[PDB]
From Swiss-Prot, chains A, B:
Keywords carried by this UniProt record: Endonuclease, Exonuclease, Hydrolase, Metal-binding, Nuclease, tRNA processing, Zinc
Cofactor section: Zn(2+)
Signal sequence region: none
Family stated for the protein in its record: Belongs to the RNase Z family. RNase BN subfamily.
Annotated coiled-coil segments of the chain: none
SMART domains, per the entry: Lactamase_B
Protein name, per record: Ribonuclease BN
EC assignment: 3.1.-.-
Length: 306, 306
């Protein structure tokens, strides 16, 4: 369950090596094994096309903000989806204007969809409840209304300790069913056993925070708070922190420090400036690591376990 | 002077091997050495970025029609142009709606340009006169208003035959200047020489026809008429001619036959269906060739001399 597949990792504009923003979320569930997409910069559909993922599995698309490097690319994807035989329904979630944009693009281009498409203009707060996980939007600091997304899968109820029960005399099968239900079923050995003393340790869910572009901000800490994996931009190095901050971006240290401040398992930085070359990106990594060793650099097509 | 650089050659949707439509026209002139772009499907700017062409030289963009596979990609290019330091002015020519599309995209995405941008809603007829060449729009048969573009460079006035003059006694230099002007300057050898009898054979210009998507149509022959190079779609093979024609497309034979009918030097087919693989595209080529041997298959990044 839960995989991140980076399609684009470049700030603002594409480069020979990194395409603009798009992050894929593979949700491997027993009955919810679908695909989710966070952002859609130009070329996203191309990027996808080169992977073996089934474009049909993708059912939801979450846009953080409407800047070209996170949005242009969506109209083409929608048309390509339809031109394939995909008919599985699709839902887009994003800030106001998202609907006007998509509609206009489709209108003028003489396009449609042969699959039901639902566009949802969102705002801060819970966005949806899978029944298995919930997504929550958090407002960030950026030139355009921009949301971060916290994806949390509800905690799994603690399961019965089969071994402990077997140890206690309860045989597998018959009264096993009942003890499962909760019944305080008594044993032929003259002894009552309350299944509630064996349904131990209810495993907590995995927590993921995919941020939208942002400079330091209040809500930032909430989104991050103890999440397993935190995806955060690191557009510029420390010496450019002011430049970054002025445009709604964060510096290497700012991201790492927030990681630390929020006690998150792993930090994945992206949206790196086209100004830095491969080595420059390793220098960015070092900056983050020397303030939070558990940081990694995303790359086009790089994968991550939540 | 005059080069075609194909950026995308795929019908409707991108593929692992061919991107959607975009054709580059390199105009190498003594004082007009700029770049021209015909169509802008998604990924066009990416495609460009991988070539050594100076994106700054590009000053004009011609859109045949507004279908996504010829249009999405334009907004991203404009933003990237501006994000570089490009300031050289840019002009877009295309059917109605082109302006509304570009503007809306830029508005919603919170973008601008730091270079003057001129959008021009066109219709049939001459589009511009370079002074060196003229571009003319021709209406075609397709689900959306779609124009073909004839680019003709005016004929070069015949130059003076230096040799013939030297043969006739006229020395290089002095009276050479005058004979150039037209003066019937007389020679010391007692003899008048009218420069008009030496300014021989006025070389005709090169003629290029970049078609937009189309099924057979009346105007098609005009656009094509004797042009040096004819770029025409060949979306489907002969056995699919009806399917093709029903959607505003042409079959292999239809394109070749029009080539022949119009007496054009070379035929370059593109906008091939993602349905055909490499071999299938060679089968498409054969079809064209057996009705007009001078046909070639465009490929992403393939170049052509007009
Ligand atoms: Zn961005
Ligand atoms: Zn942004
Ligand atoms: Zn087309
Ligand atoms: Zn079309």
């Amino acid at each position: 369950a839960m995989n991140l597949i980076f399609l684009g990792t470049s700030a603002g504009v594409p480069t020979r090596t990194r395409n603009v923003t798009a992050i894929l979320l593979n949700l491997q569930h027993p009955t919810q094994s679908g695909l989710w997409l966070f952002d859609c910069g130009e070329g996203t559909q191309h990027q996808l096309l080169h992977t073996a993922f089934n474009p049909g599995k993708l059912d939801k698309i979450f846009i953080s903000h409407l800047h070209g490097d996170h949005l242009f690319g969506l109209p083409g994807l929608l048309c390509s989806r339809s031109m394939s035989g995909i008919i599985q329904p699709l839902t887009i979630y994003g800030p106001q204007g998202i609907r006007e944009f998509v509609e206009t693009a489709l209108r003028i281009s003489g396009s449609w969809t042969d699959y039901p498409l639902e566009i949802v203009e969102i705002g801060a707060g819970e966005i949806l409840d899978d029944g298995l996980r919930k997504v929550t939007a958090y407002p960030l600091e950026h030139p355009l209304e921009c949301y971060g997304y916290r994806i949390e899968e509800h905690d799994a109820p603690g399961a019965l300790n089969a071994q402990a029960l077997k140890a206690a005399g309860v045989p597998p099968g018959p009264l096993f069913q009942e003890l499962k239900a909760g019944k305080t079923i008594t044993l032929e050995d003259g002894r009552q056993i309350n299944g509630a003393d064996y349904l131990a340790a209810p495993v907590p869910g995995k927590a993921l925070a995919i941020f939208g572009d942002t400079g330091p901000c209040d809500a930032a800490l909430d989104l991050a708070k103890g999440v397993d994996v935190m995806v955060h931009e690191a557009t510029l190095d420390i010496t450019m922190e002011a430049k970054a901050n002025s445009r709604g971006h964060s510096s290497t240290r700012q991201a790492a420090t927030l990681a630390r401040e929020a006690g998150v398992g792993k930090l994945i930085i992206t949206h790196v400036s086209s100004r830095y070359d491969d080595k420059g990106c390793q220098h960015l990594l070092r900056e983050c690591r020397s303030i939070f060793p558990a940081t990694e650099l995303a790359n086009d097509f790089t994968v991550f376990n939540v």
